[PDB]
Design a protein around this ligand. Structure first.
Ligand SMILES: *C/C=C1/C(=C/c2[nH]c(/C=C3[NH+]=C(/C=C4\NC(=O)C(C=C)=C4C)C(C)=C\3CCC(=O)O)c(CCC(=O)O)c2C)NC(=O)[C@H]1C
Ligand SMILES: *C/C=C1/C(=C/c2[nH]c(/C=C3[NH+]=C(/C=C4\NC(=O)C(C=C)=C4C)C(C)=C\3CCC(=O)O)c(CCC(=O)O)c2C)NC(=O)[C@H]1C
Lengths: 517, 517
């Protein structure tokens, strides 16, 4: 309840924009201003209250307004080129999109430092960087070169690859930090850092930048758009004010600038390319788009190399799978009995230290095996789910009665044939004591007060018990292939046995005729 | 005589193209082992006297020292740009190793090449990657890719030539200059790119031929004074091409070529071919950028192929599930219950004929061939041993399939892994397709030494006996139907066997009763 309040704020409708830019939501045909950020009282010296129901020619000039009108006319606003303007002597980069039948235009203010930065030198290493990405033979080298290039172009002190887990919390796997700067490599972070609302927003918007954490938000006047009397939806607006709790969180970490690129794999937020600077500094949108493209290439290569690793595991298990299939096919006994004829091969097929083969009230145990009654209770629990195969690296997390034998069997890989007879094969992996590193208190994710982010950011050890070694993709693949081979061989055996009985029946028909003479 | 097209030793031409200089040297002291004869015109050095001499004699002390530092203890896979001004003519240096020797190639940069800069032509690189990831169609992907490649290279014609299984390839993307012949959709004979060329290009992913009228400049000494063999210019961009290919390019009307190998899983998926009506040289930086574009193209092709396969999977999931529910609650034979609704089985794969074989009864629905012919086909199909089979041209692999090619030209067969003869076959009728070929398919070359064909006109070839291609979703549906049939059949045979061996034992008891009398 109170924890769930972390995921209830309407971040999509903040009503304010960051001071590093200007916002203009306008009517499409005549480019009449619907709302304008209050920052125009300082920038360009225009009163935002009178700038209602007025064309862009009043403030932005005739030529630039005509250029914007030409660009936005009969265009999907997905391939708009660069737009740099000098408006009363201050330069803006213009980005255009549409929220609800209205044209939202953001002018990112380019400072002198941004002007000094050029797109040529920082993207000079583009082709070689992609060559390095394709030439990397390890995931760690991939991460290293990616964060190295991203730090090279951005210039930020710390760059992190923060991969999300299923439950919401994430882990940092790549780190590139400046000297005399705190390291977060390998640290886990609570799921409360990025709420569900933030993940949902970032699944669509793949680029966020916060140049400063001490900024005072500049409200949008009029607050309600005079078209539907609602709040402007700044979901895809780079000029969106962030929640003050996040600003306090960044201040507590000690960083004053952030820049994150969403990594998307199959429409899901796989991770974030987080960045951190000890001092405020702004990054131009062109460099942000280049970093976004680097992130998309990174996601593509991650998927490619994950498939490559899965295929490598399949290849290294093909020989053992073939040997086991040949042993099962030419056993003339029950399928699981012939499988159990060679226990060591079955063990090394999955790399587990315990094997339990169940066949209709007989259980055979090899290696480190629990009490047979406990395994029977577990198996009768496992068939309730109905899944053909099951892999669990933490049985006690999902199976409450698994705490008694967590020292012997903390990882369970089970596969069963689709027949009424209770049969199956279970592989048990023992618990490994792992001291998971967390950034702060795992049992106190949030300082409950308005919510306040935790000040402490030190590394905490958590000796997580009852968790065994992760089952690899090749492991479950081998389990499924063994299940498929058992399915095929068992079907062959039953059809042949019926045929032999049928042939014996035909032989018996010959015998009955012989028994009649 | 046709096979002579794939016998020339292209890897050892003994000559280099005149647009550059080659230096193969011993690694430690950078002493020249052999040098191309082109040095008689460029830099004005006699190639005969340039034996057993350090690079300092011709290339200068500073440039020799930089090359020595770069090549020392380096894999030559991340070498930065190397531009030198040697007696007033500019060279770009590339370094690699063929056989325990350092091969260094100086590509000559003309004034036109010097004027061209890597910045402007690659300014839209990040936008190009954004367009690649944002494209929702394969045709859009190809279009934007060839558009960018034509933009940087400036060549008149750009083609995406995808290879087929048999060796011949087809052009799927075309970007041609005005008043220039179009090859969109045209098939090309496999003799255009022999097996040797494909094998060489599987390793070297970048080839450029600026001119077709060039006279090769021989390498002196021809044999290295280390192993008395020919230098292996496999990864050398300065390699002379076969004169037959030069004549082929002249016959096509192009005088410049530039190809990037597309690699998918270690296989030559296709080539990004290019064509210019006049000689023109492309700098190595733009070639490397095009290579990176090609690798990204291959990655996105694989990604979108997986996406299309998954879309087909989703659209067939409902039909597969409905058939599974109908099959599970039939209490009859598995294929009989499947055949209870023939139209649904037909629309599962989109075929016009269904043949279900169950123990000497064959049931035909829709456009079905002669039952004897289908039985012969089925007994031929089990010989291969594949669990599933898809063929879009049965007469190509089944000689007796020509009689019914009008009715069944596409066969999708799936059988259970049991000795008992059972199975499901889907038949697709022949569609008359006029395949377009560039020239004579039966006469690739005008045999007179092999000579490339002069004619490059579009030829219609009415290929009969070919049905519609079976999609990836089609074979996916076949395998899932096979899996569901496997599970249900195993359940049914296990149940019948449970209540079957009892009768056999009873018969034995009956026999025992009939024996004790
Ligand atoms: C219960 C509420 C909390 C809260 C909410 C919150 N946080 C964000 C934004 C972000 N938080 C991030 C977390 C990290 N930054 C890092 O550097 C690391 C690791 C080293 C982590 C785990 C990130 C990356 C974001 C996105 C913004 C960015 O930094 O680029 C939001 C979203 C706000 C918005 O988008 O307007 C919200 C609502 N965070 C907490 O920690 C608690 C107090
Ligand atoms: C029997 C011998 C033949 C011969 C041999 C041959 N051809 C090449 C090189 C290439 N041929 C290519 C074919 C095409 N170019 C196009 O523009 C199109 C389509 C519009 C096609 C099908 C290509 C792309 C190459 C690679 C070179 C390039 O253009 O970049 C070789 C290889 C030579 C070498 O690498 O040294 C050889 C041995 N070609 C024939 O047509 C017959 C006569």
């Amino acid at each position: 309840v109170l924890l769930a309040n972390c995921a209830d704020e309407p971040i999509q409708f903040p009503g304010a924009i960051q001071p590093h830019g200007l916002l203009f939501t306008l009517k499409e045909p005549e480019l009449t201003i619907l709302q304008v950020s209050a920052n125009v009282q300082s920038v360009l010296g225009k009163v935002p209250d009178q700038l209602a129901g007025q064309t862009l020619d009043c403030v932005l000039g005739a030529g630039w307004a005509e250029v914007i009108r030409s660009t936005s006319a009969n265009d999907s606003l997905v391939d708009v080129p660069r737009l740099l303007m000098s408006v009363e002597g201050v330069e803006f980069e213009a980005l255009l999109h549409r929220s609800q039948e209205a044209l939202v235009l953001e002018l990112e203010i380019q400072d002198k430092a941004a002007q000094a930065i050029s797109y040529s030198e920082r993207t000079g290493n583009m082709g070689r960087m992609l060559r390095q990405l394709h030439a990397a033979a390890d995931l760690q080298t991939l991460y290293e070169v990616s964060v190295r290039e991203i730090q090279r172009m951005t210039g930020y002190d710390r760059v992190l690859i923060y991969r999300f887990e299923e439950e919401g919390h994430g882990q940092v796997i790549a780190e590139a930090s400046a000297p005399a700067m705190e390291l977060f490599n390998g640290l886990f972070f609570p799921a409360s850092d990025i709420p569900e609302q933030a993940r949902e927003l970032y699944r669509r918007n793949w680029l966020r930048i916060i140049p400063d954490a001490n900024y005072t938000p500049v409200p949008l006047v009029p607050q309600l758009r005079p078209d539907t009397q609602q709040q402007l939806d700044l979901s895809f607006s780079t000029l969106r004010s962030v929640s003050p709790i996040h600003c306090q969180y960044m201040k507590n970490m000690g960083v004053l600038s952030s820049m994150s690129v969403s990594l998307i794999q199959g429409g899901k937020l796989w991770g974030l390319i987080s960045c951190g600077h000890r001092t405020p500094l702004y990054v131009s949108h062109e460099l942000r788009s280049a970093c976004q493209a680097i992130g998309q290439v990174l996601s593509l290569q991650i998927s490619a190399m994950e498939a490559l690793e899965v295929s490598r595991q399949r290849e290294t298990k093909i020989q053992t799978l073939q040997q086991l299939h040949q042993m099962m096919a030419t056993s003339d006994t029950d399928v699981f009995d012939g499988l159990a004829q060679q226990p060591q091969l079955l063990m090394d097929l999955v790399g587990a230290t315990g094997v339990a083969i169940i066949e209709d009230r007989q259980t055979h145990c090899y290696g480190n095996c629990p009490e047979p009654s406990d395994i029977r209770a577990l198996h009768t629990w496992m068939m309730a789910g109905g899944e053909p195969v099951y892999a669990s690296h933490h049985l006690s997390s999902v199976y409450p009665p698994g705490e008694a034998y967590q020292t012997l069997a903390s990882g369970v890989l089970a596969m069963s044939l689709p027949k009424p007879v209770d049969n199956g094969v279970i592989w048990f992996r023992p618990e490994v004591k792992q001291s998971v590193q967390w950034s702060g208190d795992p049992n106190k994710p949030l300082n409950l007060d308005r919510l306040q982010p935790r000040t402490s950011f030190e590394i905490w050890k958590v000796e997580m018990t009852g968790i065994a070694t992760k089952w690899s993709h090749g492991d479950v693949f081998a389990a499924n292939d063994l299940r498929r081979s058992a399915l095929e061989n068992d079907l062959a055996r039953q059809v042949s046995k019926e045929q032999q009985a049928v042939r014996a029946r035909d032989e018996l028909v010959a015998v009955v005729s012989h028994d009649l003479r």
